[PDB]
Design a protein around this motif. Structure first.
Motif, PDB file in Angstrom:
ATOM      1  N   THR A  91       1.011  -1.418  -0.030  1.00  8.89           N
ATOM      2  CA  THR A  91       0.012   0.185  -0.071  1.00  8.89           C
ATOM      3  C   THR A  91       0.820   1.258   0.083  1.00  8.89           C
ATOM      4  OG1 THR A  91      -1.775   1.114   0.978  1.00  8.89           O
ATOM      5  CG2 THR A  91      -0.134   0.112   2.641  1.00  8.89           C
ATOM      6  N   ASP A  92       0.240   2.391  -0.296  1.00  6.96           N
ATOM      7  CA  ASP A  92       1.083   3.662  -0.208  1.00  6.96           C
ATOM      8  C   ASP A  92       1.390   3.910   1.160  1.00  6.96           C
ATOM      9  OD1 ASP A  92       0.476   3.571  -2.960  1.00  6.96           O
ATOM     10  OD2 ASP A  92      -0.877   5.262  -2.956  1.00  6.96           O
ATOM     11  N   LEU A  93       2.388   4.501   1.542  1.00  9.76           N
ATOM     12  CA  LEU A  93       2.981   5.160   2.715  1.00  9.76           C
ATOM     13  C   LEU A  93       2.071   6.536   2.888  1.00  9.76           C
ATOM     14  CD1 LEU A  93       4.630   5.209   5.409  1.00  9.76           C
ATOM     15  CD2 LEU A  93       6.579   6.255   3.999  1.00  9.76           C
ATOM     16  N   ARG A  94       1.068   6.175   4.113  1.00  7.85           N
ATOM     17  CA  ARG A  94       0.421   7.499   4.434  1.00  7.85           C
ATOM     18  C   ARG A  94       0.403   7.625   5.909  1.00  7.85           C
ATOM     19  NH1 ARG A  94      -2.872   3.726   1.448  1.00  7.85           N
ATOM     20  NH2 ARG A  94      -3.824   3.129   3.485  1.00  7.85           N
ATOM     21  N   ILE A  95       0.993   8.633   6.282  1.00  2.35           N
ATOM     22  CA  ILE A  95       0.993   9.022   7.684  1.00  2.35           C
ATOM     23  C   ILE A  95       0.425  10.499   8.105  1.00  2.35           C
ATOM     24  CG2 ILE A  95       3.118   7.828   7.988  1.00  2.35           C
ATOM     25  CD1 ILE A  95       4.791  10.279   8.017  1.00  2.35           C
ATOM     26  N   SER A  96       0.115  10.574   9.298  1.00  2.02           N
ATOM     27  CA  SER A  96      -0.472  11.718   9.660  1.00  2.02           C
ATOM     28  C   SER A  96       0.347  13.011  10.244  1.00  2.02           C
ATOM     29  CB  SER A  96      -1.398  11.325  11.110  1.00  2.02           C
ATOM     30  OG  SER A  96      -0.864  10.998  12.103  1.00  2.02           O
TER      31      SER A  96
ATOM     32  N   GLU B  13      15.224  12.468   0.077  1.00  2.00           N
ATOM     33  CA  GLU B  13      14.139  13.453   0.020  1.00  2.00           C
ATOM     34  C   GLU B  13      12.808  13.033  -0.236  1.00  2.00           C
ATOM     35  OE1 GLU B  13      15.596  17.650  -1.399  1.00  2.00           O
ATOM     36  OE2 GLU B  13      16.774  16.386  -2.452  1.00  2.00           O
ATOM     37  N   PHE B  14      11.514  13.309   0.495  1.00  2.00           N
ATOM     38  CA  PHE B  14      10.473  13.078   0.231  1.00  2.00           C
ATOM     39  C   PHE B  14       9.444  14.005   0.059  1.00  2.00           C
ATOM     40  CE2 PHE B  14      11.405   8.589   1.428  1.00  2.00           C
ATOM     41  CZ  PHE B  14      12.451   8.651   1.980  1.00  2.00           C
ATOM     42  N   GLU B  15       8.460  14.061  -0.641  1.00  2.00           N
ATOM     43  CA  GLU B  15       7.160  14.926  -0.586  1.00  2.00           C
ATOM     44  C   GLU B  15       6.115  14.135   0.143  1.00  2.00           C
ATOM     45  OE1 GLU B  15       4.676  14.774  -3.939  1.00  2.00           O
ATOM     46  OE2 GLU B  15       4.520  17.040  -4.050  1.00  2.00           O
ATOM     47  N   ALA B  16       5.442  15.162   1.109  1.00  2.00           N
ATOM     48  CA  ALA B  16       4.474  14.785   1.832  1.00  2.00           C
ATOM     49  C   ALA B  16       3.058  15.609   1.298  1.00  2.00           C
ATOM     50  CB  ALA B  16       4.445  15.082   3.214  1.00  2.00           C
ATOM     51  N   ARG B  17       2.089  14.925   0.717  1.00  2.00           N
ATOM     52  CA  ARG B  17       1.016  15.253   0.053  1.00  2.00           C
ATOM     53  C   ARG B  17      -0.205  15.000   0.489  1.00  2.00           C
ATOM     54  NH1 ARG B  17       0.297  18.129  -4.574  1.00  2.00           N
ATOM     55  NH2 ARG B  17       2.556  18.319  -5.031  1.00  2.00           N
ATOM     56  N   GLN B  18      -1.102  15.880   1.176  1.00  2.00           N
ATOM     57  CA  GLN B  18      -2.028  15.601   1.922  1.00  2.00           C
ATOM     58  C   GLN B  18      -3.136  14.907   0.840  1.00  2.00           C
ATOM     59  OE1 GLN B  18      -3.344  17.908   5.523  1.00  2.00           O
ATOM     60  NE2 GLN B  18      -5.169  18.269   3.907  1.00  2.00           N
ATOM     61  N   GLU B  19      -3.812  13.779   1.444  1.00  2.00           N
ATOM     62  CA  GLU B  19      -4.984  13.266   0.736  1.00  2.00           C
ATOM     63  C   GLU B  19      -6.177  13.516   1.360  1.00  2.00           C
ATOM     64  OE1 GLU B  19      -3.657   9.159   0.644  1.00  2.00           O
ATOM     65  OE2 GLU B  19      -4.775   8.881   2.318  1.00  2.00           O
ATOM     66  N   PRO B  20      -7.451  13.346   0.525  1.00  2.00           N
ATOM     67  CA  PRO B  20      -8.372  13.850   1.029  1.00  2.00           C
ATOM     68  C   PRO B  20      -9.006  13.484   2.342  1.00  2.00           C
ATOM     69  CG  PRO B  20      -8.968  13.565  -1.213  1.00  2.00           C
ATOM     70  CD  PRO B  20      -7.403  12.852  -0.862  1.00  2.00           C
TER      71      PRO B  20
ATOM     72  N   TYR C 133      -0.897  12.079   5.100  1.00  2.00           N
ATOM     73  CA  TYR C 133      -0.135  12.678   4.017  1.00  2.00           C
ATOM     74  C   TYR C 133       0.524  11.521   3.199  1.00  2.00           C
ATOM     75  CZ  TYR C 133       0.085  17.269   6.312  1.00  2.00           C
ATOM     76  OH  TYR C 133      -0.188  18.721   6.682  1.00  2.00           O
ATOM     77  N   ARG C 134       0.370  11.486   2.117  1.00  2.00           N
ATOM     78  CA  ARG C 134       0.956  10.357   1.186  1.00  2.00           C
ATOM     79  C   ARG C 134       2.401  10.822   0.867  1.00  2.00           C
ATOM     80  NH1 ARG C 134       1.353   8.862  -4.679  1.00  2.00           N
ATOM     81  NH2 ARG C 134       1.340  11.075  -5.175  1.00  2.00           N
ATOM     82  N   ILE C 135       3.281   9.806   0.985  1.00  2.00           N
ATOM     83  CA  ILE C 135       4.649   9.888   1.048  1.00  2.00           C
ATOM     84  C   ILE C 135       5.217   9.505  -0.056  1.00  2.00           C
ATOM     85  CG2 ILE C 135       6.910   9.573   2.341  1.00  2.00           C
ATOM     86  CD1 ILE C 135       4.634  11.250   3.846  1.00  2.00           C
TER      87      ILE C 135
END
Length: 271
Positions: free
Chosen positions: A110-115, A150-157, A161-163
Protein backbone atom coordinates in the motif's frame (compact mmCIF):
# COMPACT_ATOMS: atom_id res chain seq x y z
CA UNK A 1 1.21 -0.39 39.48
CA UNK A 2 0.61 3.31 38.81
CA UNK A 3 0.57 4.56 35.23
CA UNK A 4 2.97 7.46 35.79
CA UNK A 5 5.50 5.12 37.40
CA UNK A 6 5.24 2.75 34.43
CA UNK A 7 5.47 5.61 31.93
CA UNK A 8 8.61 6.91 33.65
CA UNK A 9 10.03 3.37 33.58
CA UNK A 10 9.23 2.90 29.88
CA UNK A 11 10.60 6.35 29.00
CA UNK A 12 13.90 5.77 30.79
CA UNK A 13 14.27 2.24 29.36
CA UNK A 14 13.27 3.18 25.81
CA UNK A 15 10.21 0.90 25.79
CA UNK A 16 7.55 1.59 23.17
CA UNK A 17 4.69 -0.45 24.64
CA UNK A 18 1.81 1.90 25.54
CA UNK A 19 1.31 1.98 29.31
CA UNK A 20 -2.37 1.10 28.87
CA UNK A 21 -1.36 -2.02 26.92
CA UNK A 22 1.17 -3.04 29.58
CA UNK A 23 -1.45 -2.71 32.32
CA UNK A 24 -3.96 -4.85 30.41
CA UNK A 25 -1.30 -7.45 29.60
CA UNK A 26 -0.21 -7.55 33.24
CA UNK A 27 -3.83 -8.33 34.13
CA UNK A 28 -3.75 -11.36 31.82
CA UNK A 29 -0.56 -12.46 33.58
CA UNK A 30 -2.45 -12.22 36.88
CA UNK A 31 -5.61 -13.91 35.59
CA UNK A 32 -3.76 -16.77 33.87
CA UNK A 33 -1.10 -17.00 36.63
CA UNK A 34 1.55 -16.98 33.92
CA UNK A 35 4.78 -15.04 33.49
CA UNK A 36 5.50 -13.99 29.91
CA UNK A 37 8.00 -11.76 28.15
CA UNK A 38 7.76 -9.71 24.97
CA UNK A 39 10.57 -8.85 22.52
CA UNK A 40 11.67 -5.19 22.20
CA UNK A 41 9.09 -2.64 21.09
CA UNK A 42 10.81 0.57 20.04
CA UNK A 43 9.34 3.95 20.93
CA UNK A 44 9.40 4.85 17.22
CA UNK A 45 6.35 2.60 16.67
CA UNK A 46 4.32 3.69 19.72
CA UNK A 47 2.31 6.23 17.71
CA UNK A 48 1.60 3.67 14.98
CA UNK A 49 0.27 1.23 17.59
CA UNK A 50 -1.93 3.88 19.21
CA UNK A 51 -3.21 5.00 15.80
CA UNK A 52 -4.55 1.48 15.18
CA UNK A 53 -2.28 0.18 12.43
CA UNK A 54 -2.21 -3.62 12.06
CA UNK A 55 0.95 -5.58 12.78
CA UNK A 56 3.11 -8.02 10.86
CA UNK A 57 2.97 -11.78 11.28
CA UNK A 58 5.57 -14.51 11.02
CA UNK A 59 4.84 -14.87 7.28
CA UNK A 60 5.85 -11.22 6.70
CA UNK A 61 9.38 -11.06 5.28
CA UNK A 62 11.57 -7.98 5.07
CA UNK A 63 13.21 -5.54 7.47
CA UNK A 64 11.38 -2.57 8.97
CA UNK A 65 12.56 1.05 8.90
CA UNK A 66 13.98 3.11 11.77
CA UNK A 67 14.41 6.35 9.81
CA UNK A 68 12.51 8.69 7.53
CA UNK A 69 8.75 9.03 7.11
CA UNK A 70 8.70 5.26 6.50
CA UNK A 71 9.81 4.61 10.09
CA UNK A 72 7.91 1.78 11.75
CA UNK A 73 6.80 0.17 8.47
CA UNK A 74 8.27 -2.39 6.07
CA UNK A 75 9.09 -0.90 2.67
CA UNK A 76 8.72 -2.93 -0.51
CA UNK A 77 12.04 -1.36 -1.54
CA UNK A 78 14.40 -2.57 1.19
CA UNK A 79 16.83 0.25 0.35
CA UNK A 80 14.58 2.33 2.65
CA UNK A 81 14.74 -0.13 5.56
CA UNK A 82 17.13 -0.03 8.51
CA UNK A 83 19.48 -2.16 6.37
CA UNK A 84 20.16 0.89 4.16
CA UNK A 85 23.79 0.47 5.27
CA UNK A 86 24.26 -2.85 3.48
CA UNK A 87 25.59 -3.55 -0.01
CA UNK A 88 23.77 -4.38 -3.25
CA UNK A 89 23.56 -8.16 -2.79
CA UNK A 90 22.02 -8.06 0.69
CA UNK A 91 19.35 -5.54 -0.34
CA UNK A 92 18.41 -7.50 -3.46
CA UNK A 93 18.09 -10.62 -1.32
CA UNK A 94 15.89 -8.66 1.08
CA UNK A 95 13.97 -7.40 -1.96
CA UNK A 96 13.58 -10.91 -3.37
CA UNK A 97 12.39 -12.17 0.02
CA UNK A 98 9.84 -9.34 0.13
CA UNK A 99 8.88 -10.13 -3.47
CA UNK A 100 8.70 -13.85 -2.63
CA UNK A 101 6.13 -13.41 0.13
CA UNK A 102 4.25 -10.87 -1.99
CA UNK A 103 3.53 -13.68 -4.48
CA UNK A 104 0.90 -15.12 -2.17
CA UNK A 105 -1.81 -14.37 0.33
CA UNK A 106 0.76 -13.56 3.00
CA UNK A 107 0.69 -9.77 2.62
CA UNK A 108 0.16 -7.01 0.06
CA UNK A 109 1.45 -3.47 -0.49
CA UNK A 110 0.00 0.00 0.00
CA UNK A 111 0.96 3.66 -0.21
CA UNK A 112 2.87 5.10 2.72
CA UNK A 113 0.37 7.44 4.39
CA UNK A 114 1.04 9.09 7.76
CA UNK A 115 -0.70 11.74 9.83
CA UNK A 116 0.30 15.27 10.82
CA UNK A 117 0.96 14.09 14.38
CA UNK A 118 3.21 11.29 13.13
CA UNK A 119 5.17 13.77 11.01
CA UNK A 120 5.62 16.17 13.93
CA UNK A 121 6.79 13.35 16.20
CA UNK A 122 9.35 12.10 13.67
CA UNK A 123 10.63 15.67 13.27
CA UNK A 124 10.76 16.29 17.02
CA UNK A 125 12.23 12.98 18.20
CA UNK A 126 13.57 10.86 15.33
CA UNK A 127 15.66 13.16 13.16
CA UNK A 128 13.19 13.90 10.37
CA UNK A 129 13.29 17.33 8.73
CA UNK A 130 10.06 18.77 7.32
CA UNK A 131 9.95 21.99 5.31
CA UNK A 132 6.85 23.90 4.26
CA UNK A 133 3.36 24.17 5.70
CA UNK A 134 -0.16 23.16 4.75
CA UNK A 135 -1.00 20.19 2.53
CA UNK A 136 2.41 19.86 0.80
CA UNK A 137 5.71 19.50 2.66
CA UNK A 138 9.25 18.55 1.67
CA UNK A 139 10.87 15.91 3.90
CA UNK A 140 14.59 15.29 4.35
CA UNK A 141 15.83 12.18 6.15
CA UNK A 142 19.32 10.79 6.73
CA UNK A 143 19.77 7.06 6.21
CA UNK A 144 22.13 4.97 8.33
CA UNK A 145 24.78 5.29 5.59
CA UNK A 146 24.70 9.07 6.05
CA UNK A 147 23.07 9.64 2.66
CA UNK A 148 20.10 12.00 2.81
CA UNK A 149 16.79 11.12 1.15
CA UNK A 150 14.09 13.56 0.06
CA UNK A 151 10.35 12.92 0.19
CA UNK A 152 7.22 14.84 -0.70
CA UNK A 153 4.39 14.75 1.85
CA UNK A 154 1.10 15.41 0.05
CA UNK A 155 -2.17 15.49 1.96
CA UNK A 156 -4.90 13.24 0.57
CA UNK A 157 -8.64 13.95 1.02
CA UNK A 158 -8.93 11.90 4.23
CA UNK A 159 -6.25 13.99 5.99
CA UNK A 160 -3.26 11.65 5.76
CA UNK A 161 -0.03 12.69 4.05
CA UNK A 162 0.86 10.43 1.14
CA UNK A 163 4.64 9.97 1.12
CA UNK A 164 6.54 9.80 -2.17
CA UNK A 165 10.23 10.07 -2.96
CA UNK A 166 10.84 13.57 -4.30
CA UNK A 167 10.21 13.94 -8.02
CA UNK A 168 8.49 10.55 -8.32
CA UNK A 169 4.79 10.00 -8.97
CA UNK A 170 4.54 6.66 -7.16
CA UNK A 171 4.15 6.76 -3.39
CA UNK A 172 6.52 4.82 -1.15
CA UNK A 173 5.19 1.26 -1.03
CA UNK A 174 4.94 -0.47 2.35
CA UNK A 175 3.71 -3.94 3.24
CA UNK A 176 0.02 -4.02 4.11
CA UNK A 177 -2.39 -6.35 5.84
CA UNK A 178 -4.32 -8.42 3.26
CA UNK A 179 -7.46 -8.19 5.42
CA UNK A 180 -7.82 -4.46 6.13
CA UNK A 181 -5.43 -3.08 3.49
CA UNK A 182 -3.58 -0.89 6.00
CA UNK A 183 0.18 -0.73 6.44
CA UNK A 184 1.56 -3.10 9.08
CA UNK A 185 3.84 -2.05 11.93
CA UNK A 186 5.75 -4.11 14.49
CA UNK A 187 3.95 -6.74 16.57
CA UNK A 188 4.20 -7.94 20.16
CA UNK A 189 6.45 -11.01 19.95
CA UNK A 190 6.19 -13.47 22.84
CA UNK A 191 9.62 -14.99 23.45
CA UNK A 192 9.10 -16.47 26.93
CA UNK A 193 6.03 -18.09 28.51
CA UNK A 194 6.33 -19.39 32.09
CA UNK A 195 3.07 -20.76 33.51
CA UNK A 196 2.68 -21.50 37.21
CA UNK A 197 3.10 -25.00 38.59
CA UNK A 198 0.71 -24.26 41.47
CA UNK A 199 3.63 -25.00 21.67
CA UNK A 200 0.86 -24.34 24.22
CA UNK A 201 0.67 -20.57 23.79
CA UNK A 202 -2.45 -20.13 21.61
CA UNK A 203 -4.67 -19.67 24.67
CA UNK A 204 -2.42 -16.92 26.04
CA UNK A 205 -2.20 -15.24 22.63
CA UNK A 206 -6.00 -15.21 22.34
CA UNK A 207 -6.38 -13.94 25.91
CA UNK A 208 -3.83 -11.18 25.25
CA UNK A 209 -5.48 -10.09 21.99
CA UNK A 210 -8.88 -10.08 23.71
CA UNK A 211 -7.72 -7.87 26.59
CA UNK A 212 -6.14 -5.35 24.21
CA UNK A 213 -9.34 -5.13 22.15
CA UNK A 214 -7.74 -3.42 19.15
CA UNK A 215 -10.41 -4.94 16.88
CA UNK A 216 -10.51 -7.56 14.17
CA UNK A 217 -7.36 -7.89 12.03
CA UNK A 218 -5.54 -5.45 14.35
CA UNK A 219 -4.04 -8.01 16.73
CA UNK A 220 -0.70 -7.36 18.39
CA UNK A 221 0.04 -11.06 18.97
CA UNK A 222 0.12 -13.63 16.17
CA UNK A 223 0.01 -17.43 16.28
CA UNK A 224 3.56 -18.54 15.48
CA UNK A 225 17.49 -8.10 19.16
CA UNK A 226 15.97 -9.72 22.25
CA UNK A 227 16.48 -6.82 24.69
CA UNK A 228 15.25 -4.54 26.12
CA UNK A 229 12.35 -6.90 26.78
CA UNK A 230 9.27 -6.27 28.92
CA UNK A 231 8.02 -8.97 31.29
CA UNK A 232 4.59 -9.34 32.85
CA UNK A 233 4.20 -11.09 36.19
CA UNK A 234 1.07 -12.07 38.16
CA UNK A 235 2.63 -10.30 41.16
CA UNK A 236 5.83 -8.58 42.18
CA UNK A 237 8.47 -11.23 42.90
CA UNK A 238 11.56 -11.13 45.10
CA UNK A 239 14.61 -13.41 45.14
CA UNK A 240 17.90 -9.66 47.26
CA UNK A 241 16.47 -8.25 44.03
CA UNK A 242 12.81 -7.62 43.19
CA UNK A 243 10.94 -7.61 39.87
CA UNK A 244 7.68 -5.69 39.71
CA UNK A 245 4.45 -6.79 38.02
CA UNK A 246 5.71 -4.99 34.91
CA UNK A 247 9.49 -4.88 34.49
CA UNK A 248 12.10 -4.28 31.80
CA UNK A 249 15.09 -6.58 31.26
CA UNK A 250 17.78 -4.55 29.53
CA UNK A 251 20.29 -7.29 28.63
CA UNK A 252 21.14 -10.98 28.94
CA UNK A 253 22.48 -10.58 32.48
CA UNK A 254 19.21 -9.10 33.74
CA UNK A 255 17.40 -11.91 31.91
CA UNK A 256 19.49 -14.54 33.70
CA UNK A 257 18.55 -13.05 37.07
CA UNK A 258 14.87 -12.85 36.11
CA UNK A 259 14.87 -16.50 35.00
CA UNK A 260 16.22 -17.58 38.39
CA UNK A 261 13.57 -15.43 40.09
CA UNK A 262 10.59 -16.90 38.24
CA UNK A 263 11.91 -20.46 38.63
CA UNK A 264 12.45 -19.82 42.34
CA UNK A 265 8.82 -18.69 42.65
CA UNK A 266 7.49 -21.87 41.02
CA UNK A 267 7.18 -20.84 37.36
CA UNK A 268 8.48 -23.28 34.74
CA UNK A 269 9.39 -22.63 31.11
CA UNK A 270 11.21 -24.76 28.53
CA UNK A 271 12.06 -23.22 25.16
Amino acid sequence: MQARALQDLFDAQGVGVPVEHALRMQAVARQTNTVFGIRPVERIVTTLIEEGFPTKGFSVKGKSSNWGPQAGFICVDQHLSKREDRDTAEIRKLNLAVAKGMDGGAYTQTDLRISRQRLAELVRNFGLVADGVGPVRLLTAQGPSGKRYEFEARQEPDGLYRISRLGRSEAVQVLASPACGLAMTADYDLFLVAPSIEPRTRQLVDALNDCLGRGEHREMFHHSDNFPATFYLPRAMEHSVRFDEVCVVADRKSFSLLVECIKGNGYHFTA
